[PDB]
């Protein structure tokens, strides 16, 4: 304690200044204090004072029960000594990561059938924070999978390993501003549908992966 021993307030030495979390988890940011009597605490997000409700508790530990992407921001905590009114403050940057989200539904419950010979484009609209560091396409012959997420295929083939499937090309990524966010639009072109298959796009980023399975069943309607 300080040589002059009088009521005081200070932060504990271990205070973080960056905190990382993933969408959905509980976040805890402790305001560690030294001094006497126990200080009064107040939290601010980007300068706006926080009040406690069922979503967030702003006490000695700032607790966000289920962090969301909109919770990213700079949190300032101000400690006040209740006797002397001396104050200390500390800023914590909270960054909320998002594992890759694919907009198109992965639902094979009705199976998509295509006429023999047609050209079709499969698409994956991918959002992740940080952005995905790769987006890969995979495929499999329909016979080696189930139809009935039933993890339909036990093995997947890279679209580089295209022998025996449909003629396919992966287009360059495009980008779209959706819900205010830069989303990556990944497209696979099936040139002439002659082989029944399942296709999968997979996105990976720092905190997770996401995938979408697409059924590509081929039939020849006649007359």
């Amino acid at each position: 304690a300080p040589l002059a021993e009088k009521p005081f307030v200070a932060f504990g030495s271990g205070m973080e200044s960056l905190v990382e979390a993933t969408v959905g988890e509980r976040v805890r940011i402790p305001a560690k204090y030294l001094g006497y009597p126990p200080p009064e605490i107040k939290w601010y997000k980007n300068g706006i004072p926080l009040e406690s409700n069922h979503t967030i508790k702003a006490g000695h530990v700032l607790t966000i029960m289920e962090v969301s992407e909109r919770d990213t921001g700079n949190y300032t905590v101000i400690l006040t000594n209740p006797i002397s009114k001396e104050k200390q403050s500390h800023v914590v940057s909270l960054v909320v990561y998002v594992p890759p989200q694919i907009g198109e539904k992965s639902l094979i419950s009705p199976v998509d059938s295509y006429q023999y010979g047609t050209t079709q484009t499969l698409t994956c609209t991918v959002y992740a924070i940080p952005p995905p560091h790769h987006i890969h396409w995979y495929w499999q012959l329909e016979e080696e999978c189930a139809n009935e997420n039933p993890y339909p295929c036990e093995e997947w083939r890279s679209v580089e390993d295209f022998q025996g499937g449909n003629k396919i090309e992966v287009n360059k990524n495009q980008f779209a501003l959706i819900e205010g966010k830069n989303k990556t639009v990944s497209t696979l072109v099936i040139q002439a549908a002659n082989v029944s298959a399942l296709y999968k796009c997979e996105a990976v980023n720092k905190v997770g992966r996401g995938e979408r399975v697409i059924s590509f069943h081929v039939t020849r309607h006649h007359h």
Binding site: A176, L177, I178, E179, G180
Partner: protein, 157 residues
Amino acid sequence: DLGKKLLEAARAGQDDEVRILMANGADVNAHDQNGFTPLHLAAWYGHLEIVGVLLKNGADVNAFDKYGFTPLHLAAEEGHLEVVEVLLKYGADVNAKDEHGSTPLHLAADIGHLEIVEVLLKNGADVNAQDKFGKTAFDISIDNGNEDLAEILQKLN
């Protein structure tokens, strides 16, 4: 007249041809009865090269046509992103107002060019500017039912 030929060459994207007119003394700030200059026409049709050539040869980046449209207005309304960036680089007034009070941000919002709206905003577009009907770009996004546009603008609102 050489100026008339230059206007149409810029409109028609005749990249190699405008250069011949340029060496022959054609007026880069020639205008027609619409008030269109060659820069208006090159930017409106997204001819990135020609826009560059005109700008380097003294084309007036902030010329108003008969209705108050500046080249940046036209490039914004038609979705020519790279052209919009080059106009802004050469000093286009991001908040130029046409006869209706519309800024480039207004025109891009009404059509729905989200990326153009984003570029205008980070180059100082005034999100609060009202046209002569009292409409902001946000108002336009509500009027058009454009939720993706609203979400870009809402943050800066």
